[PDB]
Symmetry: C2
Subunit: 32 residues, 2 copies
């Protein structure tokens, strides 16, 4: 559990990074 | 914790969905 409390924080952090990275990739590819 | 075990399951599922989307975008931007 000690690693679980942080586990969700690890996937939650990567998510924000993936989103910010996706918002930058979508603006380069998904670009209008 | 009951919601934690799933929390990581939701962040882990979104990660593969995000990486699966970034893996395609990266192949266009992060192109080696």
């Amino acid at each position: 559990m000690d690693a679980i409390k942080k586990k969700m924080q690890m996937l939650k952090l990567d998510n924000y990074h993936l989103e910010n990275e996706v918002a930058r990739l979508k603006k380069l590819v998904g670009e209008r």
